[model samples]
Structures are given as C-alpha cells and as structure tokens.
Target: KDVIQKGISVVGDLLGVVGFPFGGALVSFYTNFLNTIWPSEDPWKAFMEQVEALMDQKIADYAKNKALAELQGLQNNVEDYVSALSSWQKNPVSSRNPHSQGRIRELFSQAESHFRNSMPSFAISGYEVLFLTTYAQAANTHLFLLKDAQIYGEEWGYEKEDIAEFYKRQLKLTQEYTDHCVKWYNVGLDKLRGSSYESWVNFNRYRREMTLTVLDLIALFPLYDVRLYPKEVKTELTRDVLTDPIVGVNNLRGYGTTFSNIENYIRKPHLFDYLHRIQFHTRFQPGYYGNDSFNYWSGNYVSTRPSIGSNDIITSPFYGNKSSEPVQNLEFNGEKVYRAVANTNLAVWPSAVYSGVTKVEFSQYNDQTDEASTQTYDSKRNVGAVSWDSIDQLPPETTDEPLEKGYSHQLNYVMCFLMQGSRGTIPVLTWTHKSVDFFNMIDSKKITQLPLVKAYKLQSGASVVAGPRFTGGDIIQCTENGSAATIYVTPDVSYSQKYRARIHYASTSQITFTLSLDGAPFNQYYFDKTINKGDTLTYNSFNLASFSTPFELSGNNLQIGVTGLSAGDKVYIDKIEFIPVN
Candidate 1:
C-alpha cells in the first residue's frame, strides 16, 4: 500500500496534474491499495437501487424547476443532436443550427428512456468500489451540468422546460462516462494488489477508456459566448487544449462535418477526448474550408459570428489581388493614377447640352439669381477682397467618357464613403460651374478628360470650403497672422492627379500668398509664385518653366499625405487642376 501511494505521488508530481491534490492521484492510490487488502462485502443490488433512487430524485427536482430543467436537458440534447447531425453528408454552419434543434430533441428523449429502463440492471462485479467511483463521477457531472445549464439556458435563448428535460438526460450520460472512469480505476487497484509482475491489462483498458470518455464528455461541454471578458483570468485549473477557449469553440464549430461522418454517429459531432493533448488556436473565417478540425475557430470578434470567406474577401490576397502575383516595378503614378474606374460607362447628368462653353453676357455672371456671386469693386480701399474682374474668366465645364484599364477591362469601383458630411446630409453647393462634360473641348482644350478627383455632389454646382478629406495642400491663410502653411506634392507624370487650392479672408482682413515647391515641402524650392487675396489658382501642366516637385511614381495608393496646417482654421479650395504631364 505504501509503495503504491508513493508511486502515485511520484507520477502526480512529475505530470503537474490537477483537479485533485497531487491531481488526486495519491487519494486514488491509497484508497485502491487499502481496498485490495480489505474487499467490500456490499451487494451490487443495493448499490443499483441507490443509483436508481438518486436518478429519480434528480429527475423530480429537475421537473419542479421547469425552466432550468429544460435548459439543463438541452446540454445533453445538443451533444446527442450534434453527434447525429454530423452523420449527414454535408454540413454548412448556416444550415446546422435550425436543422439539428428538433432532431437532437428526439435523440435526447430516446437516451433518457433507455437510461431509466436500465437503471435497475446497473450492476458491477466490484460493487463497493464501483459505487464509490460512480458517486465521485456523479458529483463532478452534477457541478458541470448545473453551471453549464445556467449559462446556456440564459444566454442562448433555451426555454426552461426544454433545458430541464435535456439536462437530466445529459446527467445520465455524464454519469455513465464517470462510471467508466471509476471502474477503470478499481480494476487498476485490483491489479496492483497482486504481484508487481501481474499484467494490468484490464486495468489499463479501463484507464484508457475512462480517459477517452472523459475527454469526449468535456468536448460536449457548452460555452457561454460572452460580450465582455473578466479583467483577470485564472488558467491554473484549465486544460492545455482549452487555453484559448473562444477560438477553441470556433474550431469545434468547424467540426460540423464530423456529425455526418458515420452511421448513428452521423450528425453526431465526433467528440474529441484528450486529457492533455495538443490543441491549437487559429483565425475563424466565413465558410471555412480548412483541413483542421477547428477550422471555424475564431479568436476575436466571436459575437460578430463572421464567416470563413465572405464579405470583405477583396482584403484576401489569394482571391485575385495584386499582392498574390509577382511583378517587377509595378508603377502606380503617372498615366495610371486613376485606379478607380466605373464598372460601366456612366452618363453625365442633364446631358452635355446644359454644360460646356456657352457665350455668356457679362449680365449673366453678375446676375442676382446666382447666390454664390459676390460683389467686387474696383476700389483700392479693400485691396485683399474679391474683385469683379476675377469673376470674368470661368473654366469651361468638361465631361469625359469613362476611363479604362488595359484596353480590355475597367477596374471595379470600390465605394469609398467620403469623410465630409453633417449628420446624414451635406450643406448644399451653389456653383458657377454646372454639369459640364470634361470630355467636351472648349477653345483651350486644357482638360483632356474629367479630373480623377471626385467632388461631392453639389446641390447646385461646386462650392469652395466643401467636400472630401484633402490628402495634400498648403495653408492659403493662417489663423494666427504670424504662421505660414504649405503642401508639397510630387507630379504624377502618368496619371492626371489634381493639385488644387482655395483661399478666403476674414470679414475684414486678408493677405497675399506665395506657392513654393521642392522635393519636400520645407526644402529649397524650384518654383515660388505669389497671389493676392480672393484670387483662386489652379495648375496642372508641368512645363520646364512651371515650379513643381520632381515627378515620380509608386504603386497605386499614393504615399501623398498633407503637411503643415493650423489645427483649427478655414481655408477655401477655390482652384483645382488635373493635368496629364508627359
């Protein structure tokens, strides 16, 4: 007895086992050792009667609790159902929930009937030991069943009646699994009593069987999906395989196909039973098609219930993304700047008839009907405000046929929800510029196509100080009179990238400004130009004479970001230019 106790202690210490002191091995060792020397004189019939009485008591108590009882019943029902459900030929996650709910109910009913009918025949060769062992197992199963039933019933919408009914059946199954464990331990105890040379064949078989059953039963354990995690988690008592339980459950979900794998076992989620086996955690995908059993293992965002391969699939490179293919020097700038192309050629609103160059009388530009038209005077008293002459020249409205990729295809349009909007609506735009096709030529033909830069749809026409997050630009005016602002942008020689600017003055004050450029915004400049207040400037052509940043290219999404601006101030973008530079 002492030798066996010592052996158990050593194994416990080495394995770092748990669930009982020295993983409860020492207790089992000593009990079994003493039992071998002093066999029980108890009858199997008495024990069987007691087991039946216990089941009857539990069932009655469950029935009284109605709601809780039904939910408890579901725990067993789910396992039974999942086991049978897996037997089907194909199982998709979308299809699993509704289909198995009812079918599992039937199986749960069947298992319960069988258990009750056979309760009287519950006999074992090792009467007292089996009784003690079964008691221990029942205790463990009881704790788990109550804990799981509460969580599953409350959170997953399980009804009280069904939960109670299902839990009782599960209690029976768990009892059986625990009974197997006890029997195996007793057999091993019996073997150790004889000579050390005695083969522990039966004992070993029970040990393995118990181990396997326990593992499978644990797999059936339900997890309550939580919206929040406890700030602190204690892992000392958790299994190695259940380290990341959220992800573990997701993988379990992927084992949907396992239910239909074998007859009777079909649709029964093949329960994995490993006491201390290797397990892994991985990302869950929509419609997962992985070889791993826990392929549906979603580590984060479990409540969102994301599928394996749907929705944002473009973010996945393998599904026809440029990232998946090898290429040399993929140019992003220059003529290829417009990565966005319409899915199909779209029409300009109201037709080109209402747009383009129409010979306008001076009376039209000065009309009181144009709400945006501001009064400008020739007087020098207000030197920095709008002057009537600046309004004399207007850029022609031009629209273009849709842009294309390769000669054969057009890039699919990715809808980017622009940043500027007040609540759900944007304040209207009152523009001198109307729906003019950029493709139509005016006398100068400066714009060969529509600017790739899209402006927000204006209620009337384009307006200053409105629409979209500006990626690059300089301060036309500083809030504090002392500071200056600037934006430096490299020329996209291949595609027409717009360079735009807007300027405005306080009700009573304003200033003149200069535009300078270098490879970098603050570095020594190649071009420096000045403008008076109320003057809008637009430049696109990169001639040798034009002061601009050196032209270069990168892959499509621009490294172009804005630099230098006061945190809170208003600047008008009165000018924009998208020109093709060779």
Candidate 2:
C-alpha cells in the first residue's frame, strides 16, 4: 500500500499535491485516501489501469525535470562565477598557494562542480541510467583521487609507503574510469539516434555538444596509456576543462590560477563554453601501457629504446658487440604476443658488412636494391669490405699473440633488431644491454646532539661550556687569527667514503675557511661575502668527494681542518653533518 502511494505521488504536483521536493510520497498518500472511500465490483482491474497511467506520466515528467534542472543550474550561477573569476585574474600567482587564497578556491571548486554536474545525462527512456551513472561515478572517483594526492603527495612530501599505496589505487581507478568513459561514448551514440524527440532543432544542438564531449574524451585516451609508465624516469599531465580553444589559453598561461579563465568563458560563452564538454574526461588518467612507449611530440607512440630495424629486419650501422644482442618481443591487443633473440653469428660480425636470418624463406621486394628474392637472409646485401662467406678472419690485435691463439682484442659482437608490419600486434624491442638507472626533513628538536669527537669548544675561561646559548652542546669558537678547529672521524671501509658535509656556524666578520683531511689542505670556503655582525650562516652541501684526495684511506682517523680565523672574529661552529653519497 505504501509502495502504491509512493508511485502515485511522484506525479503528485500535476495531480494536486501541494509543495514537496519529491511528489511520489504525497501522490501515494492521496491515492490511498481515494481507495479507502471506493469499493466497486471491478475494483482490481480499475486499480491496475490507474497504476499504469500514473507510471507512464511519472516517467515522462521525471525526464523533462532532470534535463530542465541541469540547464537551469548553469544559467543561474553565471554572476557568482564571474565575480570569483575576476579576483583570481587580478593576481594569479598569489592564488597558487593553498593557504592564502581561500575565497578564490571556494568559488573555483563550486564553478567546476557545477560545470561537471550540469552536463546533460542523455538518459533516453530510463534505460541509459546505468550508463550515465557509470560516467558520473568515474568522474567522482577521479576527483576523490585528486584531492587525496594533493594532501598526501604535495603537502606531505610523498612519504614512501603513501606513494606506493597511492600508485596502486591510481592504477585500479584509472582503468575503471577509462573503461566506463569509453563504454558511455560508444553506446550513447546509437542511443541518441534511436530515441524519439520533441524538437530536432534542439536535439541536433544537444548532439553536437555530445559529440564534442566524446572528441575531447577520445583525445585523452593516449594520456592513460603512457602517463605513468613505470620504466619512465618522469611523467607530466595537463588537463583542459573546456574546449580546444580555451584549453589552449589555459596552457599558454602555464600554471594559471584556478578559475582565472572562468570569467572569459562566461562573458563569451560561444567561445569558451567547451569547459562543460571537457569536465567528465578524467585527469586521473595515469597508467603503464603495453610497451614502455612514450607519447612522442609528433603525436605518435614510439618505443623508448633505440630501433635498428623493423618487420623482422635487424641492422647494426654503428659499433656492435656480441655481448649486447638485439632482442624483440610482440604484443597483441595490449597483451604480449611473441619475443625472440636475433643471433647473426657473422663470426664476421663487425667484419661482415651485413648479416641476417629469417624464420622462413619468403619472396620479398627490396626497395633499396630494386630486387626481389625468396631466400633466407636474401634481402641482406654485404656492402662492407669484408665478406660473410669468406673464412672467418680475426682482426689484427695490437697485443702480441700467435695466429693460432686468436686476436687478443676479441670482444663480443652486438646485434640491434627492428620489427615491421606488426599490424594489430605491438612489438616491444628491449635493448637488453641498456639500463638507464628522498630523505625526510629532520626535526630540529630531535637532532639536538652532536657526535662527540676531537672537535673542541672555545671558552671565556677553562671550564667546559654548557647551556641553551649553544645548541648541540657548547659551541666550538676560535677567536684567534689563523686558528683552526680540528675534528677527527674514523670511517670504516664498509661505509661509503664519498660524502657531503654541512657546516653550521656564526661569524662576525668575513672569513675564508679552508678544509683539510689529514695534513693536506683541500679547498678554501668563503663565508659572509660581506662582513656580518654575529649573523649565522648555515653552510650546506659542501662536496667532500670533490676534495683533492677525497679521503685519507691509509690513516685510521680522518681530520677536518677548519682554518683562517682572525683575532676578535667570533666564529662559532654549531653543528657539522656528513651525509653519505646516494
């Protein structure tokens, strides 16, 4: 009985239910009251007919109201969005800082949310509700991930565990988001055509806008494939909230403050209205594509490794070493297909101008030679001084070795292969020979102690120094000219000898400080390019490895010789740190 009333109430406003957000409840109550007074011989058939009529009208009314609301919301918020946009445009750089620009972001977030939420659901006959929901859900997931990253990665210095967890979440979410968008765009196209409409004029406009959104979404498909390639050293992503023209403007500004361009869009909606179309396209599109390929500048996806040949062809124009052989692998429909190693035992490698082999003997036309052949290694034309058929000849070595013993300078041959005519199959060529291979900010309170060594503290009198006046124990001060603080440290062989040392000191006058290991002078470090009146200067990132001998391995103790102190010069050494090379 409650369900019957609820269904009736959805169309209640038309059926005389007074003010309510949803008409279903009110319609249901009114229907039940009518039933209480009526008792007829054909009551069941009449009640069924009434229910069907209510259901039919409710569906039509819901569709119209949903579309009307989406269009109305954007129309209503134009003024507020324009005002916020003006504030950001006046000083865009200052707005990039999250703390200071509170109002600017509030307006920005509201405008962005409105733009995305107002997009036409294109829900035809209610069946497309599932597709529309999937698209919106994908967008929400991406927004949530973006908020999470801004807090964790940018604000917190991307803690190791947090970054790893973020990456996994991103992987799963990006795939789901991309897959849903693709499905919506593909299925929604036919749905639009199949549905009946009130006006073809407005329907065509809707179609135009819908297709633009699809185009923008497809433009970003390559983004998900290459954006977070694990093998890549660095990745960068950019997003446009509108159409191509306005998106270009945002890019030109290069880090423009949020909502800086919203005003322009509002002023000339004809030119900048693309933001509505771009809103649902995912910015969280980061993932590893099938091959470790890059979105190249030419708009092509190219392999990161060097390519020597293609379509089962391999060539080595430069120096080749047998130790580094050319390898190939195949991929089909984003999956790995086949892989093989090319072994051109040209016992005449560098000696032979050309060497090749194919799995089968097939007729092939040679564009370079204008010839056709059906023989294994048939395309190969030895263009070098050496011959592949000649008895394997060893190159002359500078070293003195008998002919029977072979050349002393013998090195492994290197082969580089290239693939061609992959069609639907993707070839992943890995250069087996090639390999191109943060600390937390320390809290000062916890790092208040220094390692006790031979480094001494200068005092007004002979009593050992103390108190908060000197952090990390009493300061080591040298008031005399040419005086030095000799600090000794013994590094074990297991410890990395290369290091970077930081010296924290306060000086009253300009001074040249020289560092020495053992007895030898390393280099002079200048402080206070101008004289300072007891101003503290934190000398950081001095390369100890750059020192003349770097380290004195022969001696058990390594000495830090800080010299060049003058009389009346209040130079105090607060703390020194040696960080190993990474």
* TM-scores of all predicted structures: 0.19, 0.21
Each model's RMSD to truth, in Å?
A: 36.4, 31.2
Write model 2 residue lDDT over 1-582, tens digit each, in one string.
222222222111111221111223333432443332122212222322332232232335465456445534533343454444344444555445654345544444454456455443434444342233223322432333233232324333445675456546545544444444445544544433422211221223223333222323322222222122111111111111111110111121122211222222212100000000000000011113312211100001212111111122122232111211222221111111111221111111222111222121212233345444332211122112211210021122111333222111111111121212210111112111000000011112111112211233222321222211112123445465553444434443443355444455556665565555555655556665233545432222111112222322233223333345555555554445443343
Which candidate number would show the highest lDDT if scored against the true structure?
2
Candidate 1, residues 1-582: lDDT per residue as tens digits? 121222222222212211112214323433432232112222222322333332222223322234233323433443453355344214543664644545644564454453344332222333433343233322333333233333334333457886766556554544454444444444544543322111222232233222222322232221110111101110111111100001111122122212112112111111111111111112212112222111111111101101111112112111111211122121111111111101101112332100010011111121133222112111111112211121111111111222121111111111111011110100000111121221122111122111112221111121223111111111122333322322222332445333322122221122333333332331122221233334432221111122243222222212111222233432332222222234
Instruction: State each model's CA lDDT, in order.
Output: 0.24, 0.29
Stretches of model 1 off by over 4 angstroms after superposition: 1-104, 119-122, 125-158, 168-180, 196-582
lDDT of 1: 0.24
Candidate 2 TM-score, true structure as reference: 0.21
Q: Candidate 2, which ten residues in sequence have the lowest lDDT sum?
A: 271-280
